[PDB]
Amino acid sequence: KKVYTTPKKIRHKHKKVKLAVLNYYKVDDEGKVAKLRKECPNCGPGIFLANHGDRFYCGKCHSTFATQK
Amino acid sequence: YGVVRYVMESGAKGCEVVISGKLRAARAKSMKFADGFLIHSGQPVNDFIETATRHVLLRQGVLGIKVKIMKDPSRNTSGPKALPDAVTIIEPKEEEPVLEPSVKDY
RNA sequence: ACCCACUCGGCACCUUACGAGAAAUCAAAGUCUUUGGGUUCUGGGGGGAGUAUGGUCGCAAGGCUGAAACUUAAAGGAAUUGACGGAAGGGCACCACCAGGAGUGGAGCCUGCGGCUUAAUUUGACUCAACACGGGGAAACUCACCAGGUCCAGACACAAUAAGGAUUGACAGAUUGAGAGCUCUUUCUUGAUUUUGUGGGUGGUGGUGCAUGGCCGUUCUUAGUUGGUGGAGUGAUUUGUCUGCUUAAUUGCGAUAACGAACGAGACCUUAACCUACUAAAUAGGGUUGCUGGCACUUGCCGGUUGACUCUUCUUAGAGGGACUAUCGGUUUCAAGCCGAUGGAAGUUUGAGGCAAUAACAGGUCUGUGAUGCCCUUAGACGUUCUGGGCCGCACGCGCGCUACACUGACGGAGCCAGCGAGUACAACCUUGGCCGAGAGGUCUGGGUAAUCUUGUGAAACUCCGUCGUGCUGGGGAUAGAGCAUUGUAAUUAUUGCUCUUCAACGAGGAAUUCCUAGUAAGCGCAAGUCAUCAGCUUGCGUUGAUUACGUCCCUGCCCUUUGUACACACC
Numbered sequence: 001k002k003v004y005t006t007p008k009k010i011r012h013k014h015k016k017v018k019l020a021v022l023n024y025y026k027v028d029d030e031g032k033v034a035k036l037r038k039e040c041p042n043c044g045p046g047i048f049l050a051n052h053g054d055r056f057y058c059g060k061c062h063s064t065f066a067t068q069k
Numbered sequence: 070y071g072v073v074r075y076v077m078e079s080g081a082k083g084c085e086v087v088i089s090g091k092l093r094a095a096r097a098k099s100m101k102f103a104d105g106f107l108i109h110s111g112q113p114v115n116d117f118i119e120t121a122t123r124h125v126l127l128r129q130g131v132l133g134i135k136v137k138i139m140k141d142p143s144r145n146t147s148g149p150k151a152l153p154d155a156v157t158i159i160e161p162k163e164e165e166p167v168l169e170p171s172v173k174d175y
Numbered sequence: 176a177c178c179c180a181c182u183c184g185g186c187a188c189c190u191u192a193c194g195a196g197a198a199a200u201c202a203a204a205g206u207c208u209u210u211g212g213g214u215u216c217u218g219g220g221g222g223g224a225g226u227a228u229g230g231u232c233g234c235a236a237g238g239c240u241g242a243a244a245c246u247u248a249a250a251g252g253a254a255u256u257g258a259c260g261g262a263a264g265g266g267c268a269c270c271a272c273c274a275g276g277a278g279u280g281g282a283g284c285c286u287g288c289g290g291c292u293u294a295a296u297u298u299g300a301c302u303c304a305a306c307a308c309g310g311g312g313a314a315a316c317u318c319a320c321c322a323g324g325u326c327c328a329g330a331c332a333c334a335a336u337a338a339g340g341a342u343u344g345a346c347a348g349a350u351u352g353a354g355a356g357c358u359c360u361u362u363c364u365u366g367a368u369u370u371u372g373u374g375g376g377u378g379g380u381g382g383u384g385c386a387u388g389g390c391c392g393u394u395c396u397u398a399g400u401u402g403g404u405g406g407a408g409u410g411a412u413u414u415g416u417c418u419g420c421u422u423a424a425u426u427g428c429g430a431u432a433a434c435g436a437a438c439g440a441g442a443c444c445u446u447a448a449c450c451u452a453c454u455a456a457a458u459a460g461g462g463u464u465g466c467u468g469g470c471a472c473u474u475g476c477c478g479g480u481u482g483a484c485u486c487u488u489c490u491u492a493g494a495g496g497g498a499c500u501a502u503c504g505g506u507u508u509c510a511a512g513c514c515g516a517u518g519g520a521a522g523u524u525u526g527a528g529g530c531a532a533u534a535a536c537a538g539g540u541c542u543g544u545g546a547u548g549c550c551c552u553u554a555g556a557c558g559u560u561c562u563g564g565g566c567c568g569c570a571c572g573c574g575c576g577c578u579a580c581a582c583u584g585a586c587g588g589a590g591c592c593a594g595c596g597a598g599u600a601c602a603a604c605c606u607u608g609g610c611c612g613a614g615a616g617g618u619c620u621g622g623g624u625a626a627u628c629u630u631g632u633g634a635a636a637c638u639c640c641g642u643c644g645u646g647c648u649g650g651g652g653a654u655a656g657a658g659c660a661u662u663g664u665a666a667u668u669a670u671u672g673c674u675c676u677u678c679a680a681c682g683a684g685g686a687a688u689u690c691c692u693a694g695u696a697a698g699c700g701c702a703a704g705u706c707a708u709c710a711g712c713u714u715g716c717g718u719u720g721a722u723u724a725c726g727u728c729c730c731u732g733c734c735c736u737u738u739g740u741a742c743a744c745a746c747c
């Protein structure tokens with residue numbers, strides 16, 4: 001068989017990068033539990049849309065939300 | 070040999086066992102163990118001769134076992150009761166004929 | 176001089192050995208383990224070597240005499256079955272040749288295989304027995320190759336994270352060939368499935384057919400092969416299994432230390448032929464007869480209708496029968512058989528096949544296999560899966576084929592006849608009939624899971640009358656150019672179908688060499704096979720249908736017999 005040449009690139013996948021987990025919430029003056037980031041209109045509170053620079057995609061819907069806010 | 074003996078006991082006209090493959094040493098050979106009658110050619114082959122081919126797997130290579138049995142034509146149940154070439158004639162009966170006319174009457 | 180009979184001596188010879196001998200053979204090579212008549216000479220595995228040396232005899236060449244070191248597991252003898260022979264005999268075969276036919280090799284083209292070329296142009300096979308073969312007619316798939324990307328289909332075992340997350344998912348654009356989250360921008364999801372290593376595997380159109388199976392091909396579809404007694408040999412062996420004549424045949428008649436047998440051949444089975452004899456039919460065909468269409472017009476002729484009734488010749492297919500070389504005539508040990516009539520559906524094994532022995536081949540397949548050993552490989556995989564390309568490239572060799580080089584034609588009409596087939600409901604099969612289109616094709620409708628519909632597959636070659644009459648001409652059709660269709664996701668590297676145009680090579684093919692003996696050769700289509708689409712290929716099938724042997728070893732190959740052999744890995 002032919003001599004293996006290979007033209008570079010030994011790529012990999014997204015290994016997740018585990019950040020903080022519960023950073024999309026705030027708890028203040030004893031008992032209160034206030035929400036950070038807009039909750040998903042497709043499926044209610046628990047799943048909250050990712051807020052970027054006019055980019056509003058989901059996780060359970062995986063991608064299906066794009067409208068401006 | 071044992072197989073052949075068994076076949077004989079079962080009352081078959083002939084047995085032919087071919088064992089093909091590597092039976093000691095790499096260079097392989099088909100050994101042939103036979104007894105009795107056997108036919109080979111013609112339509113009486115599919116009538117009386119029953120065949121079997123099974124390949125045996127061993128950790129150095131494959132064997133192939135080919136077994137033929139020539140069933141007795143007389144013990145047939147359904148189909149022809151002999152080989153087509155076999156012609157056997159019946160025996161005549163004894164005669165003391167002449168002894169001059171006479172008539173049996175009722 | 177013969178002739179007969181006897182007799183001593185000689186050169187030999189023939190048959191038997193009851194004796195010898197390893198046997199070939201031997202009246203001595205006998206009277207030898209049942210060993211002694213008298214004597215002379217010579218040998219003690221093969222080489223080294225009739226050499227070295229010393230004598231001696233020779234004019235000389237040489238002779239007589241004659242070692243050893245060292246080397247070596249054999250050298251040899253007689254026979255055996257093979258194999259082979261530029262030995263001698265006898266067979267057989269259109270894969271031999273005659274008598275002929277049809278040709279290929281020449282030409283243009285399809286298409287195999289080289290060689291070259293290439294990122295790759297994937298490989299397997301190279302006399303018959305590789306070369307339109309791998310059912311190999313590749314647009315991707317196939318796919319084994321190449322340029323690139325994607326995925327885990329990394330079992331299970333043991334461990335590091337063990338949820339403050341193991342880890343799955345990811346639109347928008349740059350990313351990328353790319354509505355591949357391939358990822359890098361991201362920060363939303365996912366919940367212990369897993370991932371990171373180490374044991375361990377699994378997949379591989381990876382490798383080896385020289386490790387194998389199975390299948391096949393070939394010796395060989397040739398007539399060959401074997402054992403039980405008996406005979407001959409000390410034995411391997413041999414005879415049976417053969418001088419002849421026969422046959423397609425070790426098929427027989429025969430001859431005979433063999434006799435009777437088995438496998439193969441034959442028998443068989445499938446098919447193709449005949450059946451006014453059965454058994455049958457509105458899924459076959461008829462008859463009369465209803466109604467009915469056209470005729471002459473007398474009753475008569477051709478029709479359309481599953482309207483009645485009946486029939487089975489043709490039809491299909493069940494059960495039978497029938498040919499056994501029958502009858503006769505020749506010819507031959509008056510045998511087996513062969514030849515000629517005659518009758519017959521049938522007289523080449525009645526035609527054609529299917530099956531097909533003993534022994535084999537380092538024949539071909541590990542690219543048919545969840546047939547497979549071992550080796551390689553095993554997450555930048557030789558697993559895969561997408562994407563494009565390649566298998567199809569051309570100075571060139573050869574291998575099957577198609578088309579043709581015309582007047583036995585060509586082109587136009589018109590006439591107008593087949594047999595094998597195949598064919599869908601979960602798909603998209605075969606597809607009449609009606610309209611649209613010069614075509615190709617559309618379209619609407621159908622009929623058919625089929626002796627029912629396609630289909631009477633009204634197929635070609637053909638036959639009838641016409642146009643050109645032998646000029647690379649209206650022979651011939653290659654390249655081309657443009658359009659219109661069709662299949663498919665995709666047609667440039669024309670898939671293919673059609674339309675107009677273009678009109679190339681070739682006036683029957685050298686050295687060679689294939690196939691063939693009767694419904695055969697050859698001509699001509701059709702058909703299934705692959706197939707979404709593509710036929711110059713293939714298994715069948717019909718249609719048209721000859722010429723010439725009815726033989727022989729001259730060539731070629733095979734077989735046997737006799738011989739020779741120092742070969743038996745067998746003349747490479």
Ligand SMILES: [Mg+2]
Nearest residue numbers: 003004005006
């Ligand atoms: Mg590489």
Ligand SMILES: [Mg+2]
Nearest residue numbers: 109110111439
């Ligand atoms: Mg037989």
Ligand SMILES: [Mg+2]
Nearest residue numbers: 110111441531
């Ligand atoms: Mg036979």
Ligand SMILES: [Mg+2]
Nearest residue numbers: 219220221222
């Ligand atoms: Mg010696």
Ligand SMILES: [Mg+2]
Nearest residue numbers: 252253254741
């Ligand atoms: Mg000798």
Ligand SMILES: [Mg+2]
Nearest residue numbers: 270303304732
């Ligand atoms: Mg041959």
Ligand SMILES: [Mg+2]
Nearest residue numbers: 287311313566
């Ligand atoms: Mg090819």
Ligand SMILES: [Mg+2]
Nearest residue numbers: 307312710712
């Ligand atoms: Mg083809």
Ligand SMILES: [Mg+2]
Nearest residue numbers: 379380542544
């Ligand atoms: Mg495989």
Ligand SMILES: [Mg+2]
Nearest residue numbers: 384537538539
């Ligand atoms: Mg082999």
Ligand SMILES: [Mg+2]
Nearest residue numbers: 404405406413
């Ligand atoms: Mg004997």
Ligand SMILES: [Mg+2]
Nearest residue numbers: 413414415416
């Ligand atoms: Mg013999």
Ligand SMILES: [Mg+2]
Nearest residue numbers: 502503504505
């Ligand atoms: Mg006669």
Ligand SMILES: [Mg+2]
Nearest residue numbers: 524526527528
């Ligand atoms: Mg026959």
Ligand SMILES: [Mg+2]
Nearest residue numbers: 384385537538
């Ligand atoms: Mg080989």
Ligand SMILES: [Mg+2]
Nearest residue numbers: 379381382541
């Ligand atoms: Mg393999």
